[PDB]
Ligand SMILES: CC(C)S(=O)(=O)NC[C@H](C)c1ccc(-c2ccc([C@@H](C)CNS(=O)(=O)C(C)C)cc2)cc1
């Protein structure tokens with residue numbers, strides 16, 4: 086991952102960053118990593 | 134009168150035997166005691182500073198929590214100097230390593246179990262898990 | 272329509288359920304969780320107990336699903352809220368929400384101890400027959416002593432004193448050393464939770480439920496140990512299988528301790544704290560799975576109940592409910608306090 | 614294998630091969646140990662050792678009686 090982040094939503098810019106960001110915005114097909122499952126992430130993307 | 138002294142002698146014999154036995158056990162097994170039992174004990178005691186990563190789902194877990202203990206822990210961690218947050222996991226573990234034992238690190242059980250088995254091995258996990266989550270493929 | 276099965280303490284009947292009707296007659300963990308899910312997703316619901324009384328399975332013969340899953344697939348029930356273990360075969364047919372509770376396969380056996388030490392434990396390091404024998408020997412020494420005197424120079428009295436002193440010396444040294452052995456062996460944390468330890472020993476026969484995901488776990492398992500244990504459970508008569516969990520526990524309590532019962536870590540954790548505290552859990556879990564709310568495939572409820580379970584998990588409602596129905600009402604107490612007491 | 618058989622060399626190389634890749638160790642540990650019966654605490658007192666001590670005590674008392682008898686005479 087380019088930026089070196091997992092994922093978060095900045096309230097100011099309202100843009101996702103990190104692997105989650107690459108996932109939502111279509112820069113990556115699938116995310117395999119120690120990614121903690123949280124509600125805010127489950128709302129945007131699908132967790133197995 | 135002789136029975137008083139005799140029975141007293143038997144009694145004290147039993148007691149000293151018991152003491153010697155127990156002390157023998159104590160010296161044989163040598164079980165060290167952890168400074169901090171659980172997570173609540175960190176909230177009850179002011180002395181040892183404890184911290185999480187700068188950005189992560191853990192700090193998010195602490196920021197928004199309605200339970201009293203975690204609310205207090207987060208109210209502690211928010212205002213502190215110097216700031217207790219660290220940028221990488223390695224820096225956190227190293228900060229536990231150059232501590233002398235005055236710093237506690239809050240991290241997910243996986244990385245903890247992993248570091249506990251890694252050289253020098255000085256680090257260890259204490260107390261139950263604050264919450265139960267899981268990793269996933271996204 | 273919410274289908275569920277009666278299992279403690281997931282769904283239970285109230286003390287007086289006769290005068291009570293509707294959703295108010297049932298109480299339990301699953302009931303509370305149901306009320307919460309229904310609150311967040313905002314739907315009216317009616318709890319109904321599944322007719323056949325099974326969780327779920329696919330009959331090989333007729334290839335029809337039964338139980339909760341059965342009532343779910345064919346559209347007899349809108350949602351199923353119960354202790355349902357997520358498995359491959361069940362996930363293929365129906366969709367599972369993110370798991371609300373985590374469990375594993377665990378062993379339940381009879382408790383070795385009566386829950387506390389006593390005065391008689393002082394007489395433990397030296398057996399009762401040794402007590403009677405030492406008192407007897409003492410009075411023998413006494414009568415010999417009297418017989419010596421007849422009607423600092425001597426022999427008989429000297430050797431009586433010496434032999435008696437030597438005797439009591441060796442005896443009390445044995446007492447001390449044996450007590451040291453007792454306390455040292457009491458201080459040992461080890462061994463705790465050895466894997467496969469049951470698989471080797473033939474002294475204790477172990478069993479699972481008649482129909483469930485545990486027995487099925489043993490069936491399809493290619494892992495050496497579990498294959499061994501399944502081969503053992505398959506060929507053993509009288510049948511080592513039980514019909515209900517209650518029957519299993521009652522079988523362990525009446526078995527004097529020569530029987531082990533394999534069940535889910537949750538039911539084990541529950542039964543362990545119930546009076547009169549006959550049973551305990553031994554060893555780590557054999558596998559890690561989780562319970563989940565089951566919805567039919569393509570239903571509109573799936574995503575809302577998923578997000579609901581996640582929301583309840585993050586705000587810690589699930590933990591509160593579990594601690595409510597497990598540890599908070601527990602009469603036995605002990606547990607972690609017992610671990611500190613050991 | 615029978616003398617001059619065509620299987621001699623193949624079974625030889627077979628035993629060697631199966632030995633080098635550790636199959637023999639696996640089967641050995643399979644049929645001997647893994648399926649064995651014998652794999653805490655249980656510490657308890659021993660009546661019979663202390664009983665031996667009782668024997669030396671009684672010996673002392675008997676010698677005491679005899680010594681009394683020879684002392685009186
Ligand atoms: C079918 C299998 C893939 S499995 O059972 O799902 N996973 C196997 C793996 C060993 C495992 C087993 C159990 C769990 C697990 C851990 C915790 C929980 C509860 C506390 C809620 N966790 S949660 O879903 O992340 C929550 C945010 C709602 C539920 C399940 C996570 C992973």
Ligand SMILES: C=C(C)[C@H]1CN[C@H](C(=O)O)[C@H]1CC(=O)O
Pocket residue numbers: 091119120121185186188189190191192222239240241
């Ligand atoms: C190590 C880091 C930064 C990650 C790993 N899992 C958590 C996550 O997925 O957010 C973070 C740990 C934490 O927040 O303490």
Ligand SMILES: C=C(C)[C@H]1CN[C@H](C(=O)O)[C@H]1CC(=O)O
Pocket residue numbers: 278326327354355356480482483484485486533534535
């Ligand atoms: C309670 C029962 C019989 C059910 C519940 N979950 C497992 C299942 O869905 O198969 C079973 C547990 C077990 O078999 O020990």
